[PDB]
Amino acid sequence: MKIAIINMGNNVINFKTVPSSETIYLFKVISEMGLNVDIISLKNGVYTKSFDEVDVNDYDRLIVVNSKPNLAILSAQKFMAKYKSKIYYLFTDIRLPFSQEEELLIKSPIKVISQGINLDIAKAAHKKVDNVIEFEYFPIEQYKIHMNDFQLSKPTKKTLDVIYGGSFRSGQRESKMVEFLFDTGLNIEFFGNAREKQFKNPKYPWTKAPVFTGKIPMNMVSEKNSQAIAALIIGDKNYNDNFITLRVWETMASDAVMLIDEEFDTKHRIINDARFYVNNRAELIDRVNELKHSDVLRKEMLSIQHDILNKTRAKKAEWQDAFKKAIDL
Secondary structure of the chain in HEC code, one letter for each residue: CEEEEEECCCCCCCCCCHHHHHHHHHHHHHHCCCCEEEEEECCCCCCCEEHHHCCHHHCCEEEEECCCCCHHHHHHHHHHHHCCCCEEEEECCCCCCCCCCCCCCCCCCEEEEECCCCHHHHHHHCCCCCCCEEEEECCHHHHHCCCCCCCCCCCCCCCEEEEEECCCCCCHHHHHHHHHHCCCCCCEEEECCCCHHHCCCCCCCCCCCCEEECCCCCCCHHHHHCCEEEEEECCCCCCCCCCCCHHHHHHHHCCCEEEEEHHHCCCCCCCCCHHHEECCHHHHHHHHHHHHHCHHHHHHHHHHHHHHHHHHHHCHHHHHHHHHHHCCC
Q: What does the domain layout of the chain look like in residue ranges?
A: 1-144+311-329, 145-310
What's the distance, CA 170 to chain centroid?
18
Resolution in A: 2.2
Fold match between domain 1-144+311-329 and domain 145-310: yes
Q: How was this structure determined?
A: X-ray
Q: HSE, CB side, 13 Å, CA atoms: give it for residue 325.
A: 10
Pick the CATH number of 145-310 from 3.40.50.300, 3.40.50.2000, 3.40.50.2300, 3.40.190.290: 3.40.50.2000
Fold classification of 1-144+311-329 is Rossmann fold (3.40.50)
